[PDB]
Design a protein around this motif. Structure first.
Motif, mmCIF file in Angstrom:
data_model
loop_
_atom_site.group_PDB
_atom_site.id
_atom_site.type_symbol
_atom_site.label_atom_id
_atom_site.label_comp_id
_atom_site.label_asym_id
_atom_site.label_seq_id
_atom_site.Cartn_x
_atom_site.Cartn_y
_atom_site.Cartn_z
ATOM 1 N N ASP A 1 25.103 78.668 -88.819
ATOM 2 C CA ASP A 1 25.568 77.356 -88.257
ATOM 3 C C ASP A 1 25.047 77.045 -87.082
ATOM 4 O OD1 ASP A 1 27.002 75.021 -87.810
ATOM 5 O OD2 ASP A 1 29.033 75.963 -87.968
ATOM 6 N N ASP B 1 31.897 70.427 -94.776
ATOM 7 C CA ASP B 1 32.581 71.084 -93.660
ATOM 8 C C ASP B 1 31.718 71.528 -92.596
ATOM 9 O OD1 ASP B 1 35.514 70.620 -94.034
ATOM 10 O OD2 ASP B 1 35.560 71.901 -95.705
ATOM 11 N N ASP C 1 35.798 82.210 -93.435
ATOM 12 C CA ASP C 1 34.840 81.471 -93.722
ATOM 13 C C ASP C 1 33.712 82.490 -94.075
ATOM 14 O OD1 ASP C 1 32.906 79.780 -94.635
ATOM 15 O OD2 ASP C 1 32.781 78.549 -92.582
ATOM 16 N N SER D 1 39.628 82.313 -88.004
ATOM 17 C CA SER D 1 38.943 81.014 -88.509
ATOM 18 C C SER D 1 37.604 81.627 -89.280
ATOM 19 C CB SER D 1 38.899 80.062 -87.755
ATOM 20 O OG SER D 1 38.120 80.297 -86.656
ATOM 21 N N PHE D 2 36.940 82.421 -88.312
ATOM 22 C CA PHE D 2 35.639 83.029 -88.739
ATOM 23 C C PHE D 2 35.676 83.938 -89.851
ATOM 24 C CE2 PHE D 2 34.375 81.524 -84.250
ATOM 25 C CZ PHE D 2 33.196 80.453 -84.929
ATOM 26 N N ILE E 1 28.292 73.795 -96.630
ATOM 27 C CA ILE E 1 28.840 75.118 -96.843
ATOM 28 C C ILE E 1 29.913 74.985 -98.176
ATOM 29 C CG2 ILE E 1 28.629 76.143 -94.959
ATOM 30 C CD1 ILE E 1 31.703 75.736 -94.368
ATOM 31 N N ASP E 2 30.220 73.600 -98.374
ATOM 32 C CA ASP E 2 31.229 73.164 -99.393
ATOM 33 C C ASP E 2 30.838 71.821 -99.702
ATOM 34 O OD1 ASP E 2 34.222 73.432 -96.889
ATOM 35 O OD2 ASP E 2 32.717 71.919 -97.593
ATOM 36 N N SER F 1 38.723 78.307 -81.943
ATOM 37 C CA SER F 1 37.945 79.404 -82.618
ATOM 38 C C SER F 1 37.312 80.183 -81.554
ATOM 39 C CB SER F 1 37.014 79.327 -83.804
ATOM 40 O OG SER F 1 37.619 78.675 -84.973
ATOM 41 N N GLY G 1 27.757 70.875 -84.730
ATOM 42 C CA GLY G 1 28.538 72.025 -84.934
ATOM 43 C C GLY G 1 29.986 71.416 -85.010
ATOM 44 N N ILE H 1 29.827 81.334 -93.284
ATOM 45 C CA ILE H 1 28.850 81.347 -92.142
ATOM 46 C C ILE H 1 28.744 82.965 -91.452
ATOM 47 C CG2 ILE H 1 29.210 80.639 -89.712
ATOM 48 C CD1 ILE H 1 30.435 77.857 -90.954
ATOM 49 N N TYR I 1 35.644 77.839 -79.015
ATOM 50 C CA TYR I 1 35.035 76.620 -79.451
ATOM 51 C C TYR I 1 36.174 75.544 -79.233
ATOM 52 C CZ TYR I 1 31.235 79.175 -80.948
ATOM 53 O OH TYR I 1 29.990 80.345 -80.930
ATOM 54 N N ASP J 1 37.596 73.944 -81.469
ATOM 55 C CA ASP J 1 38.983 74.013 -82.501
ATOM 56 C C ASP J 1 39.625 75.269 -82.196
ATOM 57 O OD1 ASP J 1 37.134 76.027 -83.109
ATOM 58 O OD2 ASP J 1 37.214 75.624 -85.191
ATOM 59 N N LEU K 1 26.513 81.814 -85.729
ATOM 60 C CA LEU K 1 26.111 80.343 -84.942
ATOM 61 C C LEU K 1 24.721 80.432 -84.435
ATOM 62 C CD1 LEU K 1 29.216 79.473 -85.732
ATOM 63 C CD2 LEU K 1 29.022 78.020 -83.588
HETATM 64 O O1 LIG Z 1 34.159 78.049 -90.447
HETATM 65 C C1 LIG Z 1 34.667 77.149 -89.713
HETATM 66 N N1 LIG Z 1 34.626 76.114 -90.328
HETATM 67 C C2 LIG Z 1 35.133 74.783 -89.312
HETATM 68 C C3 LIG Z 1 36.218 73.989 -90.019
HETATM 69 C C4 LIG Z 1 36.027 74.089 -91.663
HETATM 70 C C5 LIG Z 1 35.538 75.095 -92.247
HETATM 71 O O2 LIG Z 1 35.399 74.791 -93.909
HETATM 72 C C6 LIG Z 1 34.249 75.632 -91.753
HETATM 73 C C7 LIG Z 1 35.060 77.499 -88.409
HETATM 74 C C8 LIG Z 1 33.967 77.126 -87.228
HETATM 75 C C9 LIG Z 1 32.378 76.714 -87.464
HETATM 76 C C10 LIG Z 1 31.631 76.297 -86.264
HETATM 77 C C11 LIG Z 1 32.408 76.207 -85.079
HETATM 78 C C12 LIG Z 1 33.698 76.588 -85.028
HETATM 79 C C13 LIG Z 1 34.658 76.793 -86.019
HETATM 80 C C14 LIG Z 1 36.406 77.623 -87.771
HETATM 81 C C15 LIG Z 1 35.558 78.673 -88.152
#
Ligand SMILES: O=C(N1CCC[C@@H](O)C1)C1(c2ccccc2)CC1
Length: 330
Positions: free
Chosen positions: A33, A15, A119, A115-116, A10-11, A83, A221, A122, A79, A81, A125
């Motif tokens: 994802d 990430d 971004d 967070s979603f 994605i970048d 999220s 993931g 994405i 999740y 993290d 999932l």
């Molecule tokens: O978009 C996400 N990223 C992960 C952290 C770095 C970012 O660049 C991308 C998130 C995510 C993705 C997949 C599972 C759980 C959380 C937090 C929303």
């Protein structure tokens, strides 16, 4: 049957990785994802709170002739993290790389965490852990792989993630041209719903290999490699100026460093993660402190072989009656 789809970072830091997925009739293509650490296929949709959508492509079930509301069904997931997302459920036709499942549960988000929203790359999932983790209530639903399994030429999928480059997810076959040497297979426990296995140890750079059992999950993931604090300390001790920063949230190192490789054991075989794969760049724009790709699992409760580890290998997720994992160098 088989399927084959390209997965793209994605970048510039890898990430996460996104893979195009066709949902509905006519097809609506969303970039999902693929997550071997969870078991829900969920998407941004026409039902997602408008303020929580910012650039994502959405699934609109009312425009799909094959979409059917799964009456009464809801879902809600959190999740590692922190999220989260939640909503209701449709069944619809889902295709990945030419492989089609009819009647797949497609979990439509009503709510997603910041967070979603933040971004834009994405769109949802696609979970590839075991269906026992699926959050749909009151009737748990099966993953895409679990639904496709019986139709596949072989009950497997493979992850071939690239370092700063596209890679491939294959369903139903092993591409023998995509790896070097042999694939070493290792036992899996499904008791926690994950692709959980035990590495046979590690080495740092050109150091001697330490034989030690490290139980963890193969999780596409999760971005980074999360390992016990002893192991992580031994790694970063070989990088001048590296330190664990409470304020930043893990190990950081001088961006001027040359990072050593990290080797993990799979049975008697060895997968080498090049030092470069462990660099996640400045902690903030313009900083000369860089974030490390190997971090402690101490605060998590499980070790996680995330993308940093998996992208160094060709990885077979074998969903036979007794599942196993295979790793090859590439
Ligand atoms: O978009 C996400 N990223 C992960 C952290 C770095 C970012 O660049 C991308 C998130 C995510 C993705 C997949 C599972 C759980 C959380 C937090 C929303």
């Amino acid at each position: 049957s088989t399927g084959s789809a390209t997965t793209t970072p994605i970048d510039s830091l890898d990430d996460a990785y996104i893979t195009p997925v066709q949902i509905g009739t006519p097809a609506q293509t969303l970039n999902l994802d693929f997550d071997t650490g969870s078991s829900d296929l969920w998407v941004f949709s026409s039902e997602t709170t408008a303020s929580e959508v910012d650039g994502q492509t959405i699934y609109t079930p009312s425009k799909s002739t094959t979409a059917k509301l799964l009456s009464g069904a809801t879902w809600s997931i959190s999740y590692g993290d922190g999220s989260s997302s939640s909503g209701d459920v449709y069944t619809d036709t889902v295709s990945v790389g030419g492989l089609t499942v009819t009647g797949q549960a497609v979990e439509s988000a009503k709510k997603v965490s910041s967070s979603f929203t933040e971004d834009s790359t994405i769109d949802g999932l696609l979970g590839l852990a075991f269906s026992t983790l699926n959050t749909v209530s009151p009737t748990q639903q099966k993953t895409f792989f679990d639904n496709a399994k019986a139709s596949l030429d072989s009950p497997v999928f493979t992850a071939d993630l690239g370092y700063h480059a596209p890679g491939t997810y294959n369903f139903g076959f092993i591409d023998t041209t995509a790896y070097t040497g042999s694939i070493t297979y290792t036992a899996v426990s499904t008791k926690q719903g994950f692709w959980e296995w035990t590495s046979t140890g590690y080495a740092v750079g050109s150091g001697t290999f330490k034989s030690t059992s490290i139980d963890g999950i193969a999780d596409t993931g999760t971005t980074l490699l999360y390992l016990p604090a002893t192991v992580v300390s031994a790694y970063w001790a070989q990088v001048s100026g590296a330190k664990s920063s409470s304020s930043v949230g893990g190990y950081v190192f001088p961006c001027s460093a040359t990072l050593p490789s990290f080797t993990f054991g799979v049975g008697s075989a060895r997968i080498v993660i090049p030092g470069d794969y462990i660099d996640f760049g400045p902690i903030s724009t313009g900083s000369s402190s860089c974030f490390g790709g190997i971090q402690s699992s101490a605060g998590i409760g499980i070790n996680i072989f995330g993308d940093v580890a998996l992208k160094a290998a060709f990885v077979v997720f074998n969903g036979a009656t007794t599942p196993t994992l295979g790793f090859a160098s590439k």
